[PDB]
């Protein structure tokens, strides 16, 4: 059956939020709401929803980052902020298409590089990033200190 | 041992220290990076001097995008720090980071962050000793568009 990757607009907010809560549980509910609104008005944020037969089966959040991005040599960079495909629809090339949409968006925005990150423990994610043409650049430990 | 924010006069020596921190970075880029830092409001480097000679530096930025482990924005980010071996373990880095931290606070950052290689044992101890807590460990990927 035919699938479409739609850049998220107001009409897909509920499809998006319903999936996003499955990728990041306990990311606060109020946060999804605000995030959705922020994204709809941004020029450096965009999200994409995989739709087929009227249902949303997956999504990707993306951004255009001007901060230094680990492993990249140019700026700005289009960055894959999160991606999720429902269990029942995996290994069908849904993420491949969502990522192509993110790449197309960042390319049209003038980015020369697309980047992403994932836990060293997320093994399927690593296989997926590599299967899709990303090469691993570096691994780092992040630190935080309250100001 | 004074710490000063970098200006045009410190570029040549900063570049010499910076090439030792990152030998793989094109010399060509140190040139452009220095100009970029001085032109941008969201960037600042600090130089530690002994008898008028630069012996350490820290590059920093105000980051506005997502930063792993942080929950607020902007974030002051320690982009790199280096102290000549002869001056190590004397609190120079501690001092450089204090200066980065004040700059950040004055820019409204509620969090300061940094990152380092899993292999950089010494760096890890330094971060810990200075009050940073480890947040996440990740692998980065890149695909040329
Ligand atoms: C990671 C994820 C988004 C991939 O979605 P997907 O739609 O199943 O991926 P695709 O079908 O487009 O797969 C692309 C490629 O990755 C590879 N791949 C996908 N799943 C794989 C698996 N489980 N094991 C090994 N390789 C796999 C394949 O090499 C290749 O497709 P093909 O060999 O079947 O021809 C999905 O597993 C998911 O939602 N996981 C949980 C959320 C998550 O971990 N996100 C990652 C970072 S936010
Ligand atoms: C990392 C580096 C900048 C630290 O510089 P420094 O001036 O020697 O550090 P400081 O003296 O200010 O030390 C501050 C804290 O780190 C600790 N520390 C410093 N060097 C240490 C070492 N080699 N092993 C264990 N702990 C160490 C100090 O004991 C502690 O002080 P405290 O008494 O307040 O706890 C320096 O070792 C260096 O330039 N390394 C090479 C470049 C690199 O690794 N950069 C880091 C990532 S960008
Ligand atoms: N590739 C997926 C990435 O997901 C998380 O980071 C995202 C972040 O997720 C937060 O982190 C928790 C999961 O660790 C979620 O609950 C959110 O609050 C999200 O809120 C931002 N809008 C975009 C960030 N990229 C991870 N922090 C990061 O390590 C991981 O690499
Ligand atoms: N705290 C040290 C950090 O240094 C490097 O990242 C810096 C980056 O260094 C590039 O990466 C190579 C070393 O990996 C250098 O040759 C430059 O090209 C520099 O060019 C940017 N101006 C600021 C980045 N923070 C590392 N990429 C990062 O992993 C590391 O944790
Ligand atoms: Ni279609």
Experimental resolution (Å): 2.0
Alpha carbon of A80 to those of B10, B66, B76, B80: distances in Å? 37, 11, 22, 24
Question: For B110, which of A67, A103, A146 is closest by C-beta distance?
Answer: A146
DSSP alpha helix (H) spans, chain A: 13-23, 29-41, 94-108, 123-131
Q: Compute the distance between CA of residue A12 and CA of residue B15 in angstroms, rounded to an integer.
A: 49
- The phi and psi torsions of A77 (rounded to 5 degrees) equal -125, 140
Does the distance separating the beta carbons of B61 and A63 come in below 8 Å? Answer: no
Q: Between β-strands B111-116 and B133-144, what pairing exists: parallel, antiparallel or unpaired?
A: unpaired
Could you tell me the strand order of the sheet in which B111-116 lies? Answer: A3-7, A45-52, A55-65, A77-85, A113-118, B133-144, A135-146, B111-116, B75-83, B53-63, B43-50, B2-5
Ligand nearest to the CA of A4: 5
Joined together, the tokens standing for residue A18 give: 């319903």
**How close does chain A come to B12, measured CA to CA in Å?**
22
Question: For A67, which of B64, B104, B116 is closest by C-beta distance?
Answer: B64
Name the β-bridge partners of A79: A63, A115
Q: Which of B4, B34, B1, B3 is nearest to B16 (CA)?
A: B34
For residue B75, give the CATH number of its domain.
3.40.630.30
**Binding site, annotated residues of A:** 24, 27, 68, 81, 83-85, 91-96, 117, 122, 138
The protein residue whose alpha carbon is closest to atom 48 in ligand 2 is B80
A34 burial (CB, 10 Å; 0-12 / 13-18 / 19+) is exposed
This structure was determined by: X-ray
Range of the domain at B134: 1-145
Chain A contacts of B139, Cβ < 8 Å? 117-120, 126, 136, 138-139
SS3 A68: coil
Q: Compute the distance between CA of residue A76 and CA of residue A2 in angstroms, rounded to an integer.
A: 33
The CB of A24 under 6 Å from ligand 3? The reply is yes
Looking at the 3D structure of chain B, how many domains does it have? 1
Q: Compute the distance between CA of residue A132 and CA of residue B5 in angstroms, rounded to an integer.
A: 43
* A75 interfaces chain B, CB cutoff of 8 Å: no
């Amino acid at each position: 059956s035919h699938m479409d990757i739609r850049q998220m607009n107001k009409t897909h907010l509920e499809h998006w939020r319903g999936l996003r809560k499955q990728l990041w549980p306990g990311h606060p509910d109020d946060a999804h709401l605000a995030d959705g609104e922020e994204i709809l008005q941004a020029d450096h944020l965009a999200s994409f929803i995989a739709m087929a037969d009227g249902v949303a089966i997956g999504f990707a959040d993306a951004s255009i980052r001007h901060d230094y991005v680990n492993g990249c040599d140019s700026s700005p960079v289009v960055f894959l902020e999160g991606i999720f495909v429902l269990p029942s629809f995996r290994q069908r090339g849904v993420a491949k298409q969502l990522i192509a949409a993110v790449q197309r968006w960042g390319t049209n925005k003038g980015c020369r590089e697309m980047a992403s990150d994932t836990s060293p423990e997320n093994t399927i994610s690593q296989k997926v990033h590599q299967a899709l043409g990303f090469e691993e650049t570096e691994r780092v430990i992040f630190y935080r200190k309250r100001c």
